[PDB]
C-alpha cells in the first residue's frame, strides 16, 4: 500500500461546489459560479475528483466527513460521465459511501447497503488495483466499513460529492 497526498481538481468540480483555497475541502454553495468550460467538469451532479488518479498499485488516503446529510465519497473510473445528470451508482462508475436520510450507506445498486458503523468522523479509503477492491475504514479504530470488489479496467480517481449545503468533505493530512 502507499499513502497519497491528494488535492481536488477545480476543473472537474461542479460549479456550485465551494473548494477550499488549499484544495482539500469541499462544500455546496447556493448557485453556480461562472467557471471556465472543460470536458472534465461535472455540469449537473455535485461532484469533484482529485487531480491524481491511479492506474496500478495500492493507494490510500483519508477523508474527514461532515455530520449532516449530503455527502458521498470514494472512487470513480475516469470515464464516469461528466455532462448531464448521471445516476450515482457503481454501473455509472462511482464506488462510494454516503450519508443520506440520517444514516450511512455503501452505494450499491439497485439497492444501497445500509451500514451499522457508529459515527464517522474520518475515513480511510484504500484502493487496491492489484486485486481489484476499494475499502473503507473508520480511522479512529480501523474498523472495516465496506469493500467493493471491482476488477478495474482504467484509471481510477478519488471522488467527492456534496449535494446539500449543510455538510462537507475534506481530504485530511
Amino acid at each position: 500500500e502507499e499513502k497519497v497526498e491528494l488535492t481536488l481538481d477545480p476543473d472537474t468540480a461542479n460549479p456550485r461546489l465551494i473548494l477550499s483555497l488549499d484544495l482539500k475541502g469541499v462544500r455546496l454553495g447556493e448557485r453556480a459560479q461562472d467557471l471556465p468550460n472543460h470536458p472534465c467538469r461535472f455540469d449537473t451532479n455535485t461532484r469533484v475528483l482529485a487531480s491524481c488518479g491511479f492506474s496500478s498499485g495500492r493507494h490510500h488516503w483519508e477523508v474527514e466527513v461532515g455530520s449532516k446529510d449530503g455527502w458521498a465519497f470514494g472512487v470513480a473510473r475516469e470515464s464516469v460521465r461528466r455532462k448531464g445528470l448521471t445516476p450515482f451508482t457503481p454501473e455509472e462508475g462511482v464506488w462510494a459511501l454516503q450519508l443520506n436520510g440520517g444514516q450511512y450507506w455503501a452505494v450499491t445498486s439497485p439497492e444501497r447497503s445500509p451500514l451499522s458503523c457508529g459515527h464517522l468522523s474520518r475515513v480511510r479509503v484504500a484502493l487496491d488495483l492489484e486485486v481489484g477492491a476499494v475499502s473503507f475504514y473508520a480511522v479512529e479504530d480501523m474498523r472495516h466499513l465496506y469493500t467493493f470488489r471491482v476488477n478495474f479496467q482504467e484509471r481510477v480517481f478519488p471522488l467527492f460529492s456534496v449535494c446539500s449545503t449543510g455538510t462537507y468533505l475534506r481530504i485530511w493530512p
Binding site: 449537473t44 451532479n45 455535485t46 461532484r47 449530503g70 458521498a72 445528470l85 450515482f88 454516503q98 443520506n100 436520510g101 460529492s161 449535494c163 446539500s164
Partner: peptide
C-alpha cells in the same frame, strides 16, 4: 423508490 430530492444530484 429511488433517491431523496437533492440526493439525485449526488
Amino acid at each position: 423508490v429511488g433517491t431523496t430530492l437533492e440526493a439525485l444530484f449526488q
